[PDB]
């Protein structure tokens, strides 16, 4: 029951799922004069995921790297509606999306209707076009215990969750005497995943331990040991070999114990079972005790997308995400598009890919606006002659700790960059600032780095 | 059981209760070469209470107006120990203080002992001298419902508690249609107390509603009504009549409904019963519906101080706080001192008073260091010839909203200030910045005000 369906306007109802890179990048460029836009997301803010590994340790504040959805929609002149809720079912036959956990509805540039909704009431939202940018969710690979005893580094609440844990262990351990093995354990951190998230997380945590904790509890700081665990034989594989080594070396120089070729078989409350494959093909078992565990491995399709696989014939055998056209249309659907991590275009799950995908689609959308037939769709795209989506790989950036980073900057075939150390760390800084989506988020981080230069980090367990 | 008592050193063990204005101002000036200092407080940070009314609405961030205790103790060269716990009993006969809810113990500039304490374990902390600066706690006057349905503006968790409430009501109300009286109620705020805390709280809340909420939900913003309730016939009575009127007028011009001569008799979930005395001496009853209620009235002695009243003969009949000498020594005690709100010197309960009291005592303490007899105390003070505490009233400052404030600046008999509007608002700004206790807290707020000038306030219900 309960169906929301506004259509007094002679504009198509475009409906966006998500408030991330895809969803927001799309919103930034969509023509609200030609279309009526509605957004559904449980998160009322955009999250600049690349600096999320700085939040917990407090290099940057959780508020500095987020921006309200409504601040974006305010720059769009036309009608924007934001439902603060989560999409539970996509219904292609009815062209609605069932939502759940409705917190709020904001109607911007709309001095008009009242939907008659109540909080936490279920409702179907009709759409003429659907853009699905709900992102992926963290994958535990069915490795038992991960969720029970570990923390993802994925959203903002995760950042607080980590600080509270580490804070609590610092407090508990410092009461125990130096000898106690429990004290050594509680001061142990284990970051699973040698992908940039994990590398940056391990590095940031270290910077704090070296630069801040040491300033007033050096007896503790010395006993803290940070482990990084990677199943592959190399860290940051998306970079050149030359840089993946320098990263690994530098991490080790900052006192991080890098466990290469090591796969976590199980996670217990106070330790995790690791298997390691060696050069000679032998498998050895290790036990790594831990106080804090950060799980920064790969991601996985959300149940809403899994749900949808079964409802469309030619998605039945999809797994990673929605199989999608060269025009980023969900195969088997006449009016649904998918961008970013919930889509499958055999491209890397990266904000870079989501950003481009979004822009391409938005431009296609105002192109559709000037064609009678859109006012069955599969064919019109090729018929009316506009390009398929071609991804342009711009490169990669990763902070390694101790004011060092690696970089590669390309466009197409040419590669032009500096990927060393201290120089690259500044580049990394600048480049990140620049590719932030808002002046506010930009100014906040600029100030956060200046205060860092003079006073180095806030670590409040209740804030 | 369990008594902590370090005394290998030939220095007296000075023990401080609290991490506020008294406790910290005292710490800033106490001579740690002559004395071994220990602090007990459940709060691990200093709170700049004058800007606490800016936190909830997000003019300033909760982190910008707080500073860790250990940051202060780090500037003190000698031994400082911080117990993160609350004092539950003061024991004059034993010269110990029983503590409870022990979270952590930090020993700074002490490469030495291990106390053998565990978390949430009870323990008595011995002292040679005790300074009690635990402050007061909010007074509901036994008016039923206040705690059940209302929020104090006292500590940092209060600021989050208020934002969450207001945020929740904004979300709920916006779903209801304009007509609905529930919508009007949920958008209703009631700030009890015409003291500067309430005035500033009501004003800040207003600035947000006018300057921010209006930018994206003007239909809501218009329906929000802020009430201010004061039992006396005037607001901000500590100021001259001329200024108390201008304040009241300006508040009314910013659309705040000021209920003068109005005392809250009872608080229900959705409304509160008010009685109002009129010019002609008639009592009329009012019902003020509310969604959010902020209780910013007077304060009250904590149970730890109440507990102590009974243990000392000449404190038996104390009520507001500990009766105290002209040397700020607790009457009836030979080694206990009390400063700030938990003390009673017939002076106003203000950070200004607590700041001076603390300095005076610290200076007295290094004076005691050079006299054999301190290495029974009541007499020595007058005998060894140093001044009693004389309070110097420096004046008063209060922000009124809409970038206006009132000010009075004096020292002794002479009064020299500008107390008008926009001018005074800047003065207010400068003067507050200057009387912050740390460069970090100072820089943070300076940046918070600049970001305000360009982007106006973060209002995140989960942060
Ligand atoms: C810690 C970290 C660091 C990273 N650093 C980098 C980097 O430096 N460079 C880089 O290129 N990439 C980086 N990434 C990857 C990048 O963040 C992702 O590729 C990107 O988020 C994908 O964009 P998206 O819009 O598909 O999903 P997201 O950006 O995650 O957004 C998905 C949105 O969907 C919402 N949502 C979830 N479920 C529902 C539902 N049922 N209904 C409605 N909405 C829903 C979410 O709240 C979210 O707003 C990083 C990722 C992480 C976790
Ligand atoms: C919102 C607000 C705004 C204010 N604005 C102003 C202003 O503009 N100007 C002004 O002059 N005054 C102002 N005040 C008043 C001023 O803050 C107090 O008079 C001053 O804080 C008193 O200092 P204190 O050390 O006595 O107590 P506080 O500064 O309150 O500090 C008390 C300390 O004791 C700790 N504590 C509590 N219980 C225990 C226990 N059992 N054991 C150990 N520690 C304990 C607390 O955590 C805290 O660290 C304001 C107060 C509030 C609430
Ligand atoms: N182009 C850019 O601007 C840019 C920059 C930085 C990062 N990124 C992207 O950000 C994304 C962040 O993802 P990520 O950092 O989690 O990398 P990832 O999730 O792709 O890699 C996770 C790693 O964990 C390892 N792993 C899996 N299971 C394991 C187990 N049981 N035990 C131990 N290790 C295990 C895997 O071998 C893998 O290398 C990446 O996809 C990356 O491409 C993009
Ligand atoms: N010198 C400075 O720099 C400076 C500046 C501002 C404030 N201050 C001090 O800080 C404090 C700020 O205010 P506060 O939080 O202490 O409040 P307060 O204790 O100053 O006053 C509380 C107010 O609430 C009223 N009230 C009491 N019961 C009531 C009821 N049932 N219904 C309605 N109203 C009721 C009282 O009449 C009183 O006006 C003051 O004590 C002030 O002296 C100092």
From Swiss-Prot, chains A, B:
Protein name: Rotenone-insensitive NADH-ubiquinone oxidoreductase, mitochondrial
Residues that coordinate or bind FAD: 13-43
Principal place of residence: mitochondrion
Stored Gene3D superfamilies: 3.50.50.100
EC number(s) on file: 1.6.5.9
Residues holding NAD(+): 187-223
Membrane topology: Peripheral membrane protein
Keyword presence, Mitochondrion: yes
Function comment: Catalyzes the oxidation of NADH generated inside the Mitochondrion.
Cofactor binding description: Binds 1 FAD per subunit.
BP GO annotations: mitochondrial electron transport, NADH to ubiquinone; positive regulation of apoptotic process
Other noteworthy facts: Present with 5240 molecules/cell in log phase SD medium.
Catalytic activity: a quinone + NADH + H(+) = a quinol + NAD(+); a ubiquinone + NADH + H(+) = a ubiquinol + NAD(+)
EC category: oxidoreductase
Originating species: Saccharomyces cerevisiae (strain ATCC 204508 / S288c) (Baker's yeast)
Family in the record: Belongs to the NADH dehydrogenase family.
CC terms in the record's Gene Ontology section: mitochondrial inner membrane; mitochondrial matrix; mitochondrion
InterPro entries on file: FAD/NAD-bd_sf, FAD/NAD-binding_dom, NDH-2, NDH2-like_C
Keywords noted in UniProt: FAD, Flavoprotein, Membrane, Mitochondrion, Mitochondrion inner membrane, NAD, Oxidoreductase, Transit peptide, Ubiquinone
Essential cofactor(s): FAD
Gene Ontology molecular function terms on file: identical protein binding; NADH dehydrogenase (ubiquinone) activity; NADH:ubiquinone reductase (non-electrogenic) activity; oxidoreductase activity
Subcellular location: Mitochondrion inner membrane
Record's keyword annotation contains Nucleus: no
């Amino acid at each position: 029951m309960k169906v929301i369906d506004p259509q007094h306007s002679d504009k198509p109802n475009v409906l966006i799922l998500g408030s991330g890179w895809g969803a927001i990048s799309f919103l930034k460029h969509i023509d609200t004069k030609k279309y009526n836009v509605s957004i559904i997301s449980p998160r009322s803010y955009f999250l600049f995921t690349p600096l999320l590994p700085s939040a917990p340790v407090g290099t940057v504040d959780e508020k500095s790297i987020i921006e309200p959805i409504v601040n974006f929609a305010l720059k769009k002149k036309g009608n924007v509606t934001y439902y603060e809720a989560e999409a539970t079912s996509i219904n292609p036959d009815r062209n609605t999306v069932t939502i759940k956990s409705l917190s709020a509805v904001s109607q911007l540039y709309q001095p008009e209707n009242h939907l008659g909704l109540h909080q936490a009431e279920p409702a179907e939202i009709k759409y003429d076009y659907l853009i699905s940018a709900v992102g992926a969710e963290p994958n535990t690979f069915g490795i038992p215990g991960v969720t029970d005893y570990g923390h993802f580094l994925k959203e903002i609440p995760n950042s607080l969750e980590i600080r509270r844990t580490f804070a609590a262990n610092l407090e508990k351990a410092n009461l125990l005497p130096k000898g106690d093995p429990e004290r050594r354990r509680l001061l142990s951190i284990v970051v699973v995943g040698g992908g940039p998230t994990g590398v940056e997380a391990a590095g940031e945590l270290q910077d704090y331990v070296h630069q801040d904790l040491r300033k007033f509890l050096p007896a503790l700081a010395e006993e803290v040991q940070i482990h990084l665990v990677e199943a592959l034989p190399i860290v940051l594989n998306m970079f050149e070999k030359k840089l993946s080594s320098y990263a690994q070396s530098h991490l080790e120089n900052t006192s991080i114990k890098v466990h290469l070729r090591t796969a976590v078989a199980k996670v217990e409350e106070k330790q995790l079972l690791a298997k390691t494959k060696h050069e000679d093909g032998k498998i050895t078992e290790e036990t790594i005790p831990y106080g804090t565990l950060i799980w920064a491995t790969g991601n996985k399709a959300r149940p809403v997308i899994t749900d949808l696989f079964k409802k469309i014939p030619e998605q039945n055998s999809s797994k990673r995400g929605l199989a999608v056209n060269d025009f980023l249309q969900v195969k088997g659907s006449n009016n649904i598009f998918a961008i970013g991590d919930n889509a499958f275009a055999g491209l890397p799950p990266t904000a870079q890919v989501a950003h481009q995908e979004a822009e391409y689609l938005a431009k296609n959308f105002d192109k559709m606006a000037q064609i009678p037939n859109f006012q069955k769709i599969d064919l019109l795209f090729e018929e009316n002659n506009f390009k398929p989506f071609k991804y342009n790989d711009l490169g990669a950036l990763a902070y390694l700790g101790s004011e060092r980073a690696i970089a590669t900057i390309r466009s197409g075939k040419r590669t032009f960059y500096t990927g060393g150390g201290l120089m690259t760390f500044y580049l990394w800084r600048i480049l990140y600032l620049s590719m932030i989506l808002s002046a506010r988020s930009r100014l906040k981080v600029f100030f956060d780095w200046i205060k860092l230069a003079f006073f180095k980090r806030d670590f409040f367990k209740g804030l």
